Amino acid sequence: MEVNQLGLIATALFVLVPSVFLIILYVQTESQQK
Amino acid sequence: MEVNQLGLIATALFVLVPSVFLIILYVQTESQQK
Amino acid sequence: SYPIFTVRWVAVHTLAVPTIFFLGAIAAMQFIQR
Amino acid sequence: ANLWERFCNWVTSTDNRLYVGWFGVIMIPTLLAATICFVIAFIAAPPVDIDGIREPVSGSLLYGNNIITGAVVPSSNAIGLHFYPIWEAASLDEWLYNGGPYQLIIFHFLLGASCYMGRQWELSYRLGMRPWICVAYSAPLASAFAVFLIYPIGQGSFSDGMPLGISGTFNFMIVFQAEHNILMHPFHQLGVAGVFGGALFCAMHGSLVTSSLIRETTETESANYGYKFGQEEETYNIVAAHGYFGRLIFQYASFNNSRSLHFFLAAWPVVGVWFAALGISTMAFNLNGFNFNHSVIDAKGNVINTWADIINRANLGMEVMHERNAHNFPLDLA
Amino acid sequence: MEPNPNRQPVELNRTSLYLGLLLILVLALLFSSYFFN
Amino acid sequence: MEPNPNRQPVELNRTSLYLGLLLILVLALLFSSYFFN
Amino acid sequence: METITYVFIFACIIALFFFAIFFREPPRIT
Amino acid sequence: METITYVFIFACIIALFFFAIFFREPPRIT
Amino acid sequence: RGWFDILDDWLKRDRFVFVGWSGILLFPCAYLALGGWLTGTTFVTSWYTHGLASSYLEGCNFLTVAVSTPANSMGHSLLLLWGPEAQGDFTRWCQLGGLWTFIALHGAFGLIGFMLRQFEIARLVGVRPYNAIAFSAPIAVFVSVFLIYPLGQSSWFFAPSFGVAAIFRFLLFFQGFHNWTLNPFHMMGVAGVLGGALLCAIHGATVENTLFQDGEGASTFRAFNPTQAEETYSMVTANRFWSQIFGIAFSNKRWLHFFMLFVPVTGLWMSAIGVVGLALNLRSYDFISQEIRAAEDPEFETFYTKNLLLNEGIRAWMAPQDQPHENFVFPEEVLPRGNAL
Amino acid sequence: DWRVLVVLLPVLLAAGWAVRNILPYAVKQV
Amino acid sequence: TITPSLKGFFIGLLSGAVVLGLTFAVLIAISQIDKVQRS
Amino acid sequence: SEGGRIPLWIVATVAGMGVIVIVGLFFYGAYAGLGSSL
Amino acid sequence: TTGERPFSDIITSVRYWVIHSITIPALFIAGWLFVSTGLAYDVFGTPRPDSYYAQEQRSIPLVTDRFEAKQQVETFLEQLK
Amino acid sequence: METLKITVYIVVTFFVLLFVFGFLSGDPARNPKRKDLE
Amino acid sequence: ARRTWLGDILRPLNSEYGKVAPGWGTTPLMAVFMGLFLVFLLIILEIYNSTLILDGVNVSWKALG
Ligand code: CLA
Ligand code: CLA
Ligand SMILES: C=Cc1c(C)c2cc3nc(c4c5[nH]c(cc6nc(cc1[nH]2)C(C)=C6CC)c(C)c5C(=O)[C@@H]4C(=O)OC)[C@@H](CCC(=O)OC/C=C(\C)CCC[C@H](C)CCC[C@H](C)CCCC(C)C)[C@@H]3C
Ligand SMILES: CCCCCCCCCCCCCCCC(=O)OC[C@H](COP(=O)(O)OC[C@@H](O)CO)OC(=O)CCCCCCCCCCCCCCC
Ligand SMILES: CCCCCCCCCCCCCCCC(=O)OC[C@H](COP(=O)(O)OC[C@@H](O)CO)OC(=O)CCCCCCCCCCCCCCC
Ligand SMILES: CC1=C(/C=C/C(C)=C/C=C/C(C)=C/C=C/C=C(C)/C=C/C=C(C)/C=C/C2=C(C)CCCC2(C)C)C(C)(C)CCC1
Ligand SMILES: CCCCCCCCCCCCO[C@@H]1O[C@H](CO)[C@@H](O[C@H]2O[C@H](CO)[C@@H](O)[C@H](O)[C@H]2O)[C@H](O)[C@H]1O
Ligand SMILES: CCCCCCCCCCCCO[C@@H]1O[C@H](CO)[C@@H](O[C@H]2O[C@H](CO)[C@@H](O)[C@H](O)[C@H]2O)[C@H](O)[C@H]1O
Ligand SMILES: CCCCCCCCCCCCO[C@@H]1O[C@H](CO)[C@@H](O[C@H]2O[C@H](CO)[C@@H](O)[C@H](O)[C@H]2O)[C@H](O)[C@H]1O
Ligand SMILES: [Ca+2]
Ligand SMILES: [Cl-]
Ligand SMILES: [Cl-]
Ligand SMILES: [Fe+2]
Ligand SMILES: [Mg+2]
Structure with a gap:
């Protein structure tokens, strides 16, 4: 099919950038003392 | 120019995945009890 | 007080004997004419 | 203190995050100008008529290049060694067509890097250090001079100076081999001994010191934490490292003196690279590599090829193809 | 420095x-069709 | 669970x-031309 | 590649279901 | 897109220079 | 304390030249590789394999002598002296290029021998075996270039020949046919070697210029004692200097020296990977977008297209003499040439 | 082949000579 | 059937066995003679 | 015989001169006979 | 040290030079004659200056067959009459 | 272009003067140890 | 540590940690086999390499039709 060529990178970054934000926050929370 | 269409997502993930790996490790290191 | 025929002696001569023979050869070669 | 005294005190202050100094006073603006012009040109400069035959070569990213092919392209053969600053052009468009950015960049850079060397002397002096790090730096610097200034002087044109780009660098190397047989030149060979040797001794030293690190850590932590910045004790056992290396070859091939050893580490690549620079700088006046073309001849007189003659065939391919529209007469005399 | x-x-x-990952992944599942168009 | x-x-x-970011970014700067081809 | 993308996102979502159920932070009574 | 990518990676590297230098972990004598 | 252990005792005696178990592999193979190279470059032709003179005996000099690879028609024959080609005849064996495989194989096993030596002595002296580990890069280079590369190609003929000028030819061949300079693995190699040289230089010079005055001499080498406990130069001064000159500086010595191991070793390993690709003509030869544009647009020119023109020259002008088994006859009229030249 | 004897006469004369000169110390060592 | 190259293989095999054998014979002998002294 | 009888400096000088002689011979060979291009 | 006699001792001893003022020239002369008698050519199969080509031949005697290579070279040599 | 040239000439002269006068301003004395170097 | 049915069954197969046979034991025998293995590899290599050429063994695509 003739899809938009930026659809792939757009979707990949849409997923990855906020997911990675969250993962960073979570892991640095787990690593705090107590 | 007739570049390879996967080049963009290839470069993007090549940079972002390991960079994000390092940022995660660094941030959870900082947050560990000093 | 010192030995003469040692591992070192052998090593040394395995290199030095052929080196002098060879140098004799190459010397001779300097006087070969077509 | 008066304003100028205060200013001098600041310039030469040992407490600036980056040392300025009087060499720095020249270095900072020239390197900034060379850098800015270089980045803008590499991204956006139009095609440049490098060989003065109205055959413009595209170097910038926006005009069809990638990182590997792109370059700031040397100034026109028509200009030769003439000084071509922006104010000599009728317009910025002319300036760009003729490769003005190249001259601006390499002059500002050569000045700026020379001052970088001086600045290394200067700070060594302010800090109570011995002065010769700058002498080590003179080797890469001399090389830069060789390919950006001296070779163009000798050949009569900045159009034959090294291009500011990756593929352009390879272009320079191949044409150099065609025209000078640099591979067969003993100064280039000393250069190769210099950098192969430098690499070798880099790995060797690194591995010996790393191999004799004194145990200060557990297996779950990096051994690096066993060294603390500014500790007075040496962090490795040089007697153990010497015992090892001395047994690897034989004892008197190994350094027991650390100062002697580190002096070696500095001298080998620096001297080798000095000869590389001098090799470029003297092939700049066409004293070329060894020519053993047709040197072996049989009893009748038939040519008996050696590997040198095969080299010569490759060089011929380079020669006959390079700058394919620029020569009108049979000898390429510069 | 203080x-x-x-x-x-x-x-x-x-x-x-x-929750956050669910939000992102489900949003992506929703908008990706429109990104490819 | 114990x-x-x-x-x-x-x-x-x-x-x-x-250092890691430098390695990644410079490797990307080097290889990207080849990925675009 | 569009199909690969749709199926990928979906698969990640199922994986997340698995972790969210079996590797939740356990509720604890005070 | 290519050009944008090349210049973007370069820009990230320059920014990285800035942080590595002015926001390095300070060396401390023991 | 039986015969094995007595032998072990003797092998590990602390003598001028240490032997070791590894010495049994190393010394004969290293000796035969060196001796073979010297024998060949002194006395042996390459007439029947390459149509070349290659010895002092024939009039070659240090730069032009070589032990040359065998004829392409030999393929990847081990070319053993007792093999089906030479059939025990030493002279013919020399004429067929037997010394090439002799030197490459004994050399390979000698390198194994030497690295085993590094492990053995490190174990004996009580140090970590990072020297052997570092030596893995030489191994990778030798094996990729002298064994894997020709094994991917038609025959041993296209391996490097063992000679100065011969190696120069190998380089130029790789430019012309493989566009090897364009290869990112070679580029990483270059960065590792030039960066290794840089680290060698800068570390040596830095140490020598942050020395403590530990003596009264103006020549300062004698003011060191291998047994001394103190650092002989100032890491703190070194660190401030480079911090203010370059922006960043080492602060950790252990890291410094590990890094010095890491850069050139990694460089050489990458270059090896590239040559493994060139074994199959799996080259970084072209940029496809470049070629599409240039084919359609006769005014589009970059340094990349310039260099391919150079490559095309190298191939056409060197192939007939460099590849005599192919019987190339390229008439004058087909040779690529620019104007006048 | 007379050439091998004319060529390897110096080598064996050398070996014989040094054997002659080092014989007592060699016997003492062995 | 034993071809010329199978014969050559036996010659190579044998020659290698002889080289290794003589080598270890001499090494073991010399080790037996010149023993390390321990107390 | 006893070691040290012949001055190490004389040995070094003589050896060195011999090396210069033989190398000098090889460079002479570069211009005469085989390899001379003539 | 590792038990061997210092090289400084050895090479500055009279006996060393009594031995080697014979053995070194002997070897040198041996190699010399290995070339001058022409034995080197025959041992290693290297062409003399008059044995690269037959008189009117201008084609390299390149080996083109793996298993009959030996015979090829022999034929090539006979071709020099 | 003439304004550009004049400008650059003034700039370059300014910085060069800073260099020269700066190194003329008691530079040997600007070190950690022996300051009396006149 | 936790016992299981299957764990209990397999327990003997992982109970002899560190247990050795005295001295050199069967090392000589092992050596022989290693020797044989070496020669074996040497053969197949040389067959593949056409250094060793045997009747009825045509190392080619044209081996069997
Ligand atoms: C340990 C040191 C060492 C090693 C690893 C090698 C390795 C090699 N040599 Mg070198 N060589 C050496 C020392 C060594 N050599 C010495 C000291 C000499 C001087 C004599 C030589 C002189 C020499 C020549 C002239 C040649 C070689 C060649 C070779 C290659 C082929 C050898 C082969 O196929 O053997 C096969 C044999 C073995 C692997 C022996 C294994 C024996 C097994 C383990 C025991 C069983 C034996 C059995 C009982 C015997 C039965 C015989 C019966 C069937 C008749 C190989 C790379 C050849 C070459 O390089 O060609 C290009 C070649 O022509 N070598
Ligand atoms: C009669 C019974 C029988 C038969 C008909 C076969 C038949 C075969 N065996 Mg098998 N084998 C048998 C019994 C048998 N075997 C038994 C009882 C054992 C003991 C368990 C084996 C163990 C064995 C091994 C280990 C191998 C075979 C292999 C083979 C195949 C050889 C042809 C080939 O492609 O080699 C190609 C392989 C070689 C010619 C060997 C190369 C050896 C290298 C060069 C040694 C050095 C490697 C080292 C990493 C150096 C790298 C350097 C390089 C990078 C330059 C062939 C199918 C070979 C195979 O699997 O091929 C696909 C193989 O490797 N066999
Ligand atoms: C051409 C470049 C080059 C050469 C000549 C070279 C040479 C050497 N490196 C050695 C070591 C090292 N090199 C190292 C890292 C590096 N080495 C590098 C590049 C080189 N290294 C680079 C770039 C690095 C960075 C990774 C390390 C870490 C070491 C060591 O630890 C070791 C050392 O001790 O150095 C002080 C020594 C190994 C001695 C030995 O194996 O004896 C045995 C001799 C044998 C086994 C014979 C090998 C025969 C060879 C393979 C084929 C025959 C070659 C002919 C005889 C000569 C042909 C010459 C023509 C091509 C012109 C030797 C001096
Ligand atoms: C005297 C000969 C000088 C030769 C050229 C210069 C060589 C040394 C320069 C290297 C600079 C490294 C960067 C700073 C490194 C650094 O800081 O050096 C420091 C080191 C030690 O300094 P010292 O203060 O202890 O001694 C120097 C003076 O103060 C006098 O004592 O300097 C030296 O060893 C001087 C060596 C003189 C003798 C050197 C000869 C070596 C080369 C011989 C020729 C080889 C040519 C081969 C061609 C095939
Ligand atoms: C007047 C100013 C002149 C210089 C200005 C610009 C200089 C920029 C210097 C590099 C800054 C980045 C450092 C990041 C990484 C960083 O912050 O490292 C800091 C690091 C500090 O080391 P330490 O010994 O303190 O580390 C000890 C422990 O932390 C180890 O875990 O220094 C090194 O490791 C030196 C070796 C790497 C040196 C790499 C230099 C690369 C040069 C640039 C090459 C790429 C250019 C691409 C062009 C597109
Ligand atoms: C191969 C073979 C073998 C072996 C043999 C051998 C082992 C040999 C050896 C040989 C040898 C071992 C030789 C040697 C030679 C040497 C020489 C030839 C030298 C020369 C030198 C020179 C020339 C010098 C130079 C220089 C330098 C280097 C630097 C300083 C300066 C000068 C310039 C002086 C056998 C029989 C087993 C088997 C068959 C095959
Ligand atoms: C799309 C590409 C993305 C790539 C993503 C890669 C994921 C990487 C996951 C890293 C896992 C981090 O692992 C994390 O380590 C830290 C310590 O380091 C642990 O932290 C633990 O040690 C510290 C320090 O003693 C304690 O203060 C803390 O209370 C304790 O729980 C965390 O419990 C663990 O979650
Ligand atoms: C420490 C280094 C010591 C180095 C010592 C060097 C000694 C050199 C002595 C030079 C004596 C020259 O002696 C020289 O001998 C050779 C024979 O071998 C003769 O050479 C003759 O034989 C060759 C072939 O072998 C012919 O190609 C040549 O045309 C013919 O003249 C020369 O006619 C003669 O001039
Ligand atoms: C085109 C190039 C220009 C060429 C000019 C040639 C001029 C020749 C005469 C130069 C006169 C030098 O004059 C120089 O400058 C000022 C004048 O207040 C002085 O001023 C300096 O004094 C001390 C010296 O320790 C410094 O610490 C202080 O920072 C500064 O005030 C210098 O000590 C003086 O020596
Ligand atoms: Ca004649
Ligand atoms: Cl060109
Ligand atoms: Cl012209
Ligand atoms: Fe160091
Ligand atoms: Mg000559």
């Missing part, structure tokens, strides 16, 4: 991570 | 972060 007294540690508990 | 005694904390100091 440390800044206004600093504060940041947290994201596991449940918030799961 | 806690695993083999767990260890992981670290990446700031200098390692900077």
